[PDB]
């Protein structure tokens, strides 16, 4: 009876990760650190990002729109199963549904704000925006997961074997929800290969 709570909870976790990706995509470009950090990066890369930030804003908007859609569909499912009596009316369903509602409100507000502050950008660059084929949230999430896993593997090889486990877990939980979003069987097979490789590593750990 309660397995549906697993689906809702997984949706909650996946959107809580995609929102982190969206925040990273925001103004604060994710820079490296440590003594090895070239002080020139915080100058050069920061300058280039300050010059080209509005594209990152558009990426943030598409990510926030995708999490809004995911939360809308999940909460619609919960609404239907509560209305039909197919889902328990109270207990843990309360907290999961309410947290989903909170995250949905936040996502709607965020995408509304990004749309407001990108209206001028869209109206300006529309002529170029036609040629570019739309970048979808699936591409962004998959690329972020792949780059996270690559960075974590490099860190693990070079003696940083402790902080890599949480990164692998987050990448796995991103791909677990990413597979459900893709429809092409080739893309799904690719995502499954990456997810199973991450699973093999996690088991090895």
């Amino acid at each position: 009876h309660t397995e549906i709570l697993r689906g809702l909870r997984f949706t909650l976790l996946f959107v809580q990760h995609v929102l982190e990706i969206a925040a990273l995509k925001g103004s604060a470009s994710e820079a490296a650190g440590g003594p090895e950090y070239q002080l020139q990066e915080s100058v050069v890369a920061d300058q280039i990002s300050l010059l080209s930030r509005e594209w990152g804003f558009a990426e943030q908007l598409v990510l926030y729109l995708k999490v809004a859609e995911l939360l809308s569909s999940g909460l619609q499912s919960a609404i239907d199963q509560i209305r039909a009596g197919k889902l328990c009316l109270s207990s843990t369903v309360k907290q999961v549904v309410r947290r989903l509602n909170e995250l949905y409100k936040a996502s709607v507000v965020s995408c509304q704000g990004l749309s407001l502050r990108l209206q001028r950008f869209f109206l300006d660059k529309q002529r170029l925006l036609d040629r570019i084929h739309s970048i979808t949230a699936e591409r962004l999430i998959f690329s972020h997961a792949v780059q996270m896993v690559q960075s974590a593997a490099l860190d693990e090889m070079f003696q940083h074997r402790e902080g890599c486990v949480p990164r692998y877990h987050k990448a796995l939980l991103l791909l677990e929800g990413l597979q459900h979003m893709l429809s092409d069987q080739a893309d799904i097979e690719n995502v499954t290969k990456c997810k199973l490789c991450i699973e093999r590593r996690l088991s090895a750990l």
């Binding site: 990066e41 050069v44 080209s52 594209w55 002529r127 036609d130 040629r131 090889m157």
Partner: protein
């Protein structure tokens, strides 16, 4: 011909049907597990020459399988365990029963039935000695096969060591090249920052509205834009700084140094072991020869005894039989000592190879992890040295934009001139050619190619080449419509830094 395989760790022969020959390495592993109960994943397989089995190649492709050159099976299970394995024997109570009977036969008086028992004992003893010799030779040749097993793993080790040393040298050279280019790469990154600042201002013409060339560069190959490229270059430079790579290469060279430990690749005392065990095999052969000789002598003495019924002969002949029996007992104990020495030598070789193989497995695993690390670092460095080429291209983008705009406008002007030039040329050519053709056709009609076409006025049948009769083919059809107005606009708006590339016809 028949297929044989070897477990070097213990030294047990593995025999298979030829059906496995048409099959391959993976099938060989599954068959090993099924018939002999060794897990697939623990099977390390090697041939003479130092090749490791890829799961694809059919086994016979690896030239091995005969009893004189089989496949070597090294078991990961047996190396994970600390202790060396135990070796079985060819166990028979016949040897001890024979010893007991020989002791008893020495105390059985001189009668015909006793001599019959003696001859039966000796006839059996010849076969016992022969079987002891055969078993010992089986063990010793099995040892001589454990040796080709060790030499095969040594060959694989040497090939791996040479490949690892070559990879380390290659990475060291590539890292030195990068090390002498860190300053240049940093300068190129600063120049890319400058060029991006510039591109932010250069308008993008309708080569497809406050779109700058930087925005066009950004919408290319997203989400891998220029900022991502710069940050990836900086990340790689952070990961490759010598404070890490120099200690890492020091550890690597230490790994190759321990790979160079000849004290483990070379079996010390090998020559002594062969020099001793082969001599003992020769000695056991000679001993069995004497045993056979004296058993036939026992048979002859029995023949003499049964016929010489005199009571004074049988006691003396039985004294001779007792002396011979003591000789046979000495020979039997010598053969059993040879058996013990051979079995203990096999066990000792098994243990020595166990320790040496533990060391070899440790060294090989360390070298393999180091090889993985070095391959990753090489990929890092090469990817970075390609990303810097991309960086230089982007650095020169703003100049090439203006130069290409100038070239396109000039080509539009040249096409404008060329169409007029070709129009005039074709006009004149068509006029002249049509006039000439009309006159020549009139003369042909008058002449009617009949009267004096070739008799007297030869070869009037010739025409002009129609040169300049048709316009030139199309060209510069795909050029963007970069009007002179667009170039003037770019000269109005572009930053001074890329104005010298525009202020030219």
């Amino acid at each position: 011909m028949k297929l044989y395989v070897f477990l070097v760790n213990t030294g047990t022969t593995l025999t298979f049907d030829t059906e496995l020959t048409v099959q391959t390495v993976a099938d060989l592993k599954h068959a090993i597990q099924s018939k002999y109960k060794i897990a697939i994943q623990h099977q390390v397989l090697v041939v003479n020459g130092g090749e490791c089995m890829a799961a694809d190649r059919r086994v016979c492709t690896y030239s091995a399988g005969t009893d004189t050159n089989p496949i070597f099976l090294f078991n990961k299970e047996m190396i994970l365990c600390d202790r060396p394995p135990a070796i079985p024997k060819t166990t028979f109570s016949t040897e001890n029963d024979m010893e007991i009977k020989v002791e008893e036969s020495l105390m059985m008086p001189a009668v015909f039935h006793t001599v019959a028992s003696r001859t039966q004992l000796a006839l059996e003893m010849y076969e016992v000695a022969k079987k002891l010799c055969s078993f010992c030779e089986g063990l010793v040749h099995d040892e001589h096969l454990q040796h080709q097993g060790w030499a095969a793993i040594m060959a694989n080790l040497e090939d791996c060591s040479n490949s690892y040393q070559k990879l380390l040298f290659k990475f060291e050279s590539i890292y030195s090249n990068y090390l002498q280019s860190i300053e240049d790469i940093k300068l190129k990154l600063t120049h890319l920052g400058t060029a991006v600042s510039v591109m932010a201002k250069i308008p993008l013409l309708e080569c497809l509205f406050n779109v700058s060339l930087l925005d066009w560069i950004n919408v290319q190959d997203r989400p891998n834009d220029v900022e991502s490229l710069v940050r990836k270059c900086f990340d790689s430079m952070s990961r490759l700084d010598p404070r890490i790579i120099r200690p890492f290469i020091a550890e690597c060279r230490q790994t190759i140094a321990k790979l160079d430990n000849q004290n483990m690749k070379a079996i010390k005392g090998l020559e002594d072991r062969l020099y001793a065990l082969d001599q003992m095999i020769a000695s056991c052969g000679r001993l069995v020869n004497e045993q056979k000789e004296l058993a036939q002598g026992f048979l002859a003495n029995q023949k003499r005894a049964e016929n010489l019924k005199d009571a004074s002969v049988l006691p003396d002949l039985c004294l001779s039989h007792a002396n011979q029996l003591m000789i046979m007992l000495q020979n039997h104990r010598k053969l059993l000592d040879i058996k013990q020495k051979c079995t203990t030598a096999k066990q000792e070789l098994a243990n020595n190879l166990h320790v040496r193989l533990k060391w070899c497995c440790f060294v090989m695993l360390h070298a393999d992890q180091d090889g993985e690390k070095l391959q990753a670092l090489l990929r890092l460095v090469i990817e970075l040295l390609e990303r810097v080429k991309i960086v230089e291209a982007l650095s020169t983008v703003p100049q090439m934009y203006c130069l290409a705009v100038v070239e396109v406008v000039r080509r539009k002007m040249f096409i404008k001139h060329y169409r007029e030039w070709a129009g005039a040329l074709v006009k004149d050519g068509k006029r002249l050619y049509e006039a000439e053709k009309s006159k020549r056709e009139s003369f042909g009609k008058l002449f009617r190619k009949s009267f004096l076409r070739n008799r007297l006025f030869r070869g009037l049948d010739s025409w002009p080449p129609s040169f300049c009769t048709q316009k030139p083919r199309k060209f510069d059809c795909e050029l963007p419509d970069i009007s002179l107005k667009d170039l003037q606009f770019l000269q109005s708006f572009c930053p001074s830094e890329v104005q010298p590339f525009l202020r030219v016809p």
